[PDB]
Design a protein around this ligand. Structure first.
Ligand SMILES: N[C@@H](Cc1ccc(O)cc1)C(=O)O
Ligand code: NA
Ligand SMILES: [Zn+2]
Length: 429
């Protein structure tokens, strides 16, 4: 039935491949949760599907169509179930349109994820499973998709979503802005912010033959000194892309909010509360554009593949800026040595964003790197991103790739960090 996630066993639909969300979201009063939505999903299937089953938590569906025709549907508990006129089979696609309105609901986690409302702002901060609050979706990272979003807001407000901004139209005191996310990312990586905000472009960044556009969002009311330092994002894109491969998206920037919250690596536009706005955090979120947004999780138990890689990116950045990488690893280790440890595959919701997922995962990569040397390690990161582009990653699959690409000894080095209940000793040269 569901995707069968080991942590969130009810989310998603087994076999469903949502390929594109075409969302028209209308927010009448930014900062208050009520909203209305009109979305068309382009869906395929990995196995014959007799129904399309989507996650939805709060809003109520009022109408549904399949390929532009009337269709049988029911909203039950936390799902919308659409009965198809005949099975959707692999290689076919159909267009599921849903009209809905109401109040998104917020879901051991670091935050209560979903559609946030505070201080005249409404915005998605939905990792892991909050997007279903404001968007009927297959809400699981194993099924990324592209997004086209039209956001309608009062004329006095503005909006920003993941994807290149094209047009803004206005009538009867309402503005509609269109954003196009052209590379597929998980549902929670869809950035979407409405309220008093301004879009500010910066010069394109050249990464060899690749061009990366630049823009940041500045919400009104930011603390004095809330900035994106000039030249920094270009330097980071160069350092990380030289380690990981081409930047996966068409644009990058941050959306700075005057709120007090964790930063989230929403696609091409990181949602950045000002309280988290630090150089290392900006690097970390940019690293997620590869590790989490492009390379997506098959199962929420494997969050260390996102958080541990993004954390290790901080050490690569530090070294690129002349700092001592081994000292940073020792800092990570000192932090863990007085905390409980766990194998890296999580078994409980409380664990998926705990210290082990970030810092034990990063030290696992440090151990691997020290085993194989920097040339092999960088080649491996390139191969890893390629191997798991279009294919959700797992801890088992990573170990297989290390074994085949780097050999049995390297796999054993990583496995000691992946498995085992006690914290291994600090990896040293
Ligand atoms: N992904 C964030 C942590 C986070 C998790 C869930 C959220 O809803 C928000 C933020 C990080 O990189 O640290
Ligand atoms: Na998909
Ligand atoms: Zn992270």
């Amino acid at each position: 039935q569901s995707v069968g996630d080991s942590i969130f066993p009810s989310l998603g639909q087994r076999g469903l491949d949502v390929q594109h969300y075409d969302l028209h979201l209308t927010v009448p009063r930014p900062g208050e949760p009520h909203l209305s939505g009109d979305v068309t999903l382009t869906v395929g299937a990995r196995e014959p599907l007799s129904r399309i089953v989507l996650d939805l938590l709060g809003p109520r569906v009022s109408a549904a169509q399949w390929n532009g025709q009337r269709v049988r549907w029911v909203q039950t508990a936390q799902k919308v179930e659409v009965t198809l006129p005949r099975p959707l089979r692999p290689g076919e696609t159909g267009r599921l349109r849903l009209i809905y309105a109401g109040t998104p609901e917020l879901s051991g986690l670091p935050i209560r994820p979903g559609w946030q409302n505070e201080a005249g702002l409404s915005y998605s901060l939905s990792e892991p499973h909050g997007t279903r609050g404001f968007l009927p979706c297959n809400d699981h990272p194993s099924d990324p998709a592209t997004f086209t979003v039209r956001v309608t807001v009062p004329a006095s407000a503005s909006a920003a979503a993941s994807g290149l901004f094209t047009t803004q139209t206005e009538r009867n005191g309402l503005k509609t802005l269109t954003f196009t996310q052209r590379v597929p990312v998980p549902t929670y990586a869809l950035g979407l912010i409405v309220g008093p905000l301004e879009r500010r472009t910066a010069p394109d960044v050249q990464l060899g033959t690749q061009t990366v556009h630049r823009r940041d969002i500045y919400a009104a009311g930011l603390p004095a000194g809330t900035t994106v330092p000039e030249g920094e994002t270009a330097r980071m894109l160069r350092v990380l892309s030289d380690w990981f491969g081409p930047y996966p998206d068409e644009v990058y920037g941050v959306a700075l909010l005057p709120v007090r919250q964790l930063a989230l690596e929403t696609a091409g536009l990181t949602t950045m509360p000002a309280t988290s706005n630090r150089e290392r955090v900006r690097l970390h979120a940019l690293a997620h554009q590869w590790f989490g947004d492009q390379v997506t999780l098959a199962d929420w138990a494997d969050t260390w593949l996102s958080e541990g890689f993004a954390t290790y990116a901080e050490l690569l950045w530090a070294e690129s800026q002349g700092e001592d990488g081994q000292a940073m690893a020792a800092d990570w280790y000192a932090r863990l040595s007085v905390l409980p440890s766990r194998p890296l595959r999580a078994t409980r919701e409380e664990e998926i964003f705990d210290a082990s997922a970030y810092f034990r995962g990063a030290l696992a990569l440090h151990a691997l790197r020290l085993k194989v040397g920097d040339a092999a390690f960088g080649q491996f990161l390139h191969s890893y991103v390629k191997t798991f582009t279009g294919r959700p990653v797992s801890t088992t699959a990573l170990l297989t790739l290390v074994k085949t690409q780097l050999g049995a000894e390297a796999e054993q080095t990583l496995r000691v960090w992946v498995e085992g209940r006690t914290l291994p000793p600090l990896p040293e040269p």
